Design a protein around this motif. Structure first.
Motif, short mmCIF file in Angstrom:
data_model
loop_
_atom_site.label_atom_id
_atom_site.label_comp_id
_atom_site.label_asym_id
_atom_site.label_seq_id
_atom_site.Cartn_x
_atom_site.Cartn_y
_atom_site.Cartn_z
N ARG A 139 70.84 -31.04 -20.28
CA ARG A 139 72.12 -30.64 -20.65
C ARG A 139 72.00 -29.13 -21.07
O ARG A 139 73.09 -28.38 -21.48
N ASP A 140 71.03 -28.44 -21.26
CA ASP A 140 70.92 -27.02 -20.81
C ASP A 140 70.89 -26.59 -19.58
O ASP A 140 70.89 -25.48 -19.14
N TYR A 141 70.49 -27.60 -18.45
CA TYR A 141 70.95 -27.25 -16.99
C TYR A 141 72.30 -27.51 -16.81
O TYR A 141 72.79 -26.67 -16.25
N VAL A 142 72.84 -28.68 -16.92
CA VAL A 142 74.32 -28.85 -16.88
C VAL A 142 75.36 -27.70 -17.20
O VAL A 142 76.20 -27.50 -16.56
N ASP A 143 75.14 -27.13 -18.55
CA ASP A 143 76.22 -26.27 -18.91
C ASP A 143 76.34 -24.79 -18.45
O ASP A 143 77.26 -24.17 -18.04
N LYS B 202 66.97 -34.91 -21.59
CA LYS B 202 68.23 -34.55 -22.39
C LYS B 202 68.22 -32.96 -22.74
O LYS B 202 69.13 -32.29 -22.31
N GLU B 203 67.40 -32.50 -23.52
CA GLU B 203 67.38 -30.87 -23.71
C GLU B 203 67.11 -30.11 -22.28
O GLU B 203 67.85 -29.17 -22.07
N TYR C 77 77.53 -25.84 -14.74
CA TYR C 77 79.09 -25.84 -15.05
C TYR C 77 79.83 -24.44 -15.18
O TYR C 77 80.77 -24.24 -14.40
#
Length: 31
Positions: free
Chosen positions: A15-19, A11-12, A22
């Motif tokens: 979604r600090d990888y995804v952003d 999760k952490e 993006y």
């Protein structure tokens, strides 16, 4: 927490990888 322990779902890290992924792709599209 024993049999309900090794659940497998990041999760952490992910979604600090995804952003960052993006706005890396929103520099492939337009920096």
């Amino acid at each position: 927490c024993s049999i309900l322990d090794i659940r497998q779902g990041p999760k952490e890290p992910f979604r600090d990888y995804v952003d960052r992924f993006y706005k890396t792709l929103r520099a492939e599209q337009a920096s």
